[PDB]
Ligand binder design. Structure first.
Ligand code: NAP
Ligand code: NAP
Lengths: 326, 122, 326, 122
């Protein structure tokens, strides 16, 4: 019921809901729409906006930056985060080496027209770079004032713990957050592995794709709608997943969850999002939206949160039948 | 082979996580049980306890079973430590046999009410 | 009797009296008067001036900065201090997180038109930010040349000690001072808890409101005078305190202290201020003044200091009847 | 649960403040008494003393009373330490009983002047 939460155990306060920019910004939607989305989010108290060097080859960062500059919002009232890993076709333009982290962040900041991001993330783990180099590089950009904090994304708890111990060993700065995928059909990591890290070393979770790219919205109950993400060019993988075997099983279960939604008095998306926020270990949930209607509806998930009683959660687990073993 | 640091009243000990995980039911072997003693600022577990004893407690894990009391540590003190680290009654009983003890058996009263009343003053 | 004192055990030398800017600068008094006050103070050897991002929403810092720039005083002859905590209505614009400390100080420095302050203070403790983050952030702005030293304000000795041990643990910079409230009717913290810290870890005290906002001046012995702070719009809380039960008891005792003042040959304000300076643990006392007359009178407290004998102090304790238990 | 570090001639010991505060009248239990040994540069108390003994001194606080002399430490040396840390005569006397001693009683001369003069050569 607390709109603002600490990101993990750091002093950074984020809105329990955030707005991301994958697919949409500089891609699927227009710059005017992106501006409309950010304005709605900001005006509704959302202070968390996520992007990445890889989104639309850097265009998502340019669009986000133009809106921030145009709207003139105080930088201190925003929490901007960007992820680093894939930054070019050249061999040295990808990974978590000191070279790419510094060059990647510097280029992202130039596109964003910002002096710094609040949190810079390693978009994924790098088997090819010693943890020490990565932790030292993250620490370096923070000491240079290019970022306030850093975090991991798609890292195992083993790898996150490693980054933490290497930080203590060399007196560096530990990551404060892991950006993990989380929704009714992807629960293992966040529910079974991240909670220990949150209590032990204060690492919080900032989860993405709460509606599994739209799958959990319910819009695909009877085929691929026109203008939906699964229909978009380049997202054949998403369409395949939805039409597959497992795909139909999910849509079947979504129809059962629909009853839970009505008993709670909310829409399916509002329930799927509120559900992600039931665990204290989840600091914030990054939302995706192709238009203003979706955002306005989704933000309503906050009213559902208080209704998620033990009974309701246990019922949802019965329907999903995928509760991870502890 | 994640390393684990255990600080006993200042005395520093290190071992591998898999060494402690060897005995899942003990205090140091169970993540939920040791969680309480972890210090995130120093990446170590801290116990405000008897130092001389711990050398043996850790060796118990390393040797996969051997629980010898240090010659320089009183039996009463060491036993208290064994119970604190929750090594379990099996290893404790096994510990007492070697420390010279065992036994402690022998049925009680008759249980026949009156038969168990005479079997007292005789 | 030593006009200049080390702030705690650091090498920073401050005048035993300093001039603050709460309420007055950019608020109650005019910019011309503020300039007149600073000039009098500076010309009388006072090198310590205190302000805060929260005072008059940043206007106190703008006024102080304009005077320093206009008068052209050498920056090396001044000891400017500013406090950080409340910097805006946004969720991320308050607290002691790394984000707000850096953004807050940077904005204060911009308003002050200075490259750095000599001491930056945490205006109050932050239950929501790990001590490590705070100490690392204070250390960061010092290494960036934005501040020379840092200190705490309204922190318990437990919290100050924590900041100190976290600094030693990570090889960071420990706070050198605590800005605590201190006057004849608020003595517990400074007389009972801070002395141990001063001797143990060198933390000195820079005390504020030596006249309890004017209450100890004696001007309220018979009601709320026109143009006094208690009469000002927004200070109803102060008026209430003065007219309350405890309020009359204080004024009653002030009348008894008036006799002590005459035996010493000084005014009541001069005695109340000199009294705050009797303990070696108090490095300096921050004065408040709405006009030049008050400042000229108050600075005279320095001549009273040598007269505060054991007997006189014990008599003052008898009248106050609030000497804290050690 | 503020932690406290005590450095004995290089040997590092740590405990909780509340553990020492358990015995307010001792040297390490009284803030005013230990103040003299604090090192603000290292955040620790330093004592240029006998190392083998301190293990027992600290355990005395941790165990809430048990004052055993280490088997490898001479009784004369250990007693000097007990007095330095000011554990008090109650625990010292209690320490000597266990270390095998006690007694040391018996009235003196008669006190009757002359009666106490004959009671000498007889
Ligand atoms: N590795 C990483 O760290 C990582 C990876 C991926 C994403 N992320 C973050 O998470 C965010 C993306 O989450 P997501 O977009 O992938 O899943 P969502 O679950 O966040 O996806 C939302 C998308 O699905 C559809 N949708 C949303 N709400 C709807 C509603 N109420 N009714 C109907 N349709 C609705 C929308 O329109 P359409 O169906 O027309 O598209 C929208 O574009 C990104 O902004 C990114 O910053 C992070
Ligand atoms: N948390 C913190 O760290 C903190 C909090 C508060 C203040 N401070 C610092 O301490 C300073 C304020 O101290 P203070 O102003 O609150 O208490 P004082 O005791 O410093 O208050 C002085 C105010 O009371 C009246 N006064 C002073 N001398 C007088 C005299 N000789 N005769 C008659 N009236 C007299 C003045 O006129 P009026 O009665 O007309 O107003 C003046 O505005 C600030 O500048 C600030 O920097 C720090």
């Amino acid at each position: 019921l607390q709109f603002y939460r600490n990101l993990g155990k750091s002093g950074l306060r984020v809105s329990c809901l955030g707005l991301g920019t994958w697919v949409t910004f500089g891609g699927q939607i227009t710059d005017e729409m992106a501006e409309h989305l950010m304005t709605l989010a900001y005006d509704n108290g959302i202070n968390l906006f996520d992007t990445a060097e890889v989104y639309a080859a850097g265009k998502a960062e340019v669009v986000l930056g133009n809106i921030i500059k145009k709207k003139g919002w105080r930088r201190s009232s925003l929490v901007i985060t960007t992820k680093i890993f894939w930054g070019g076709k050249a061999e040295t333009e990808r990974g978590l080496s000191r070279k790419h982290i510094i060059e990647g962040l510097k280029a992202s900041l130039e596109r964003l027209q910002l002096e710094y991001v609040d949190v810079v993330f390693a978009n994924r783990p790098d088997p090819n770079t010693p943890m020490e180099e990565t932790v030292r590089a993250m620490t370096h950009v923070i000491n240079q004032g290019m970022a306030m904090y850093w975090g991991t994304s798609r890292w195992s708890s083993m790898e996150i713990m490693e980054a933490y111990s290497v930080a203590r060993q060399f007196n560096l700065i530990p990551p404060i957050c892991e950006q993990a995928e989380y929704h009714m059909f992807q629960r293992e990591k966040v529910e079974v592995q991240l909670p220990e890290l949150f209590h032990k070393i204060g690492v919080g979770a900032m989860t993405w794709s709460p509606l599994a790219c739209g799958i959990v919205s319910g819009k695909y109950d009877s085929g691929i709608p026109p203008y939906s993400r699964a229909s978009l060019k380049g997202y054949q993988w998403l369409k395949d997943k939805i039409l597959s075997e497992e795909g139909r099983r999910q849509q079947a279960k979504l129809k059962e969850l629909q009853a839970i939604a009505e008993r709670l008095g909310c829409t399916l998306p509002q329930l799927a999002i509120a559900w992600c926020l039931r665990n204290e270990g989840v600091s914030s949930v990054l939302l995706g939206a192709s238009n203003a209607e979706q955002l306005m509806e989704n933000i309503g998930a906050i009213q559902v949160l208080p209704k998620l009683s033990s009974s309701i959660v246990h019922e949802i687990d019965s329907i999903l039948g995928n509760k991870p073993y502890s | 082979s994640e390393r684990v640091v255990i600080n006993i009243s200042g005395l520093r000990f290190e071992t591998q996580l898999k060494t402690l995980a060897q005995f899942p039911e003990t205090l140091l072997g169970d993540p939920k049980k040791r969680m309480r003693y972890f210090d995130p600022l120093r990446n170590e577990y801290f116990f405000d306890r008897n130092r001389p004893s711990f050398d043996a407690i850790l060796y118990y894990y390393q040797s996969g079973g051997r629980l010898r009391r240090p010659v320089n540590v009183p039996l009463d003190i060491f036993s208290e430590e064994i119970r604190f680290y929750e090594l379990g009654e099996e290893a404790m009983e096994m510990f007492r046999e070697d420390e010279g003890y065992i036994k402690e058996e022998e049925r009680p009263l008759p249980e026949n009410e009156f038969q168990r009343q005479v079997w007292l003053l005789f």
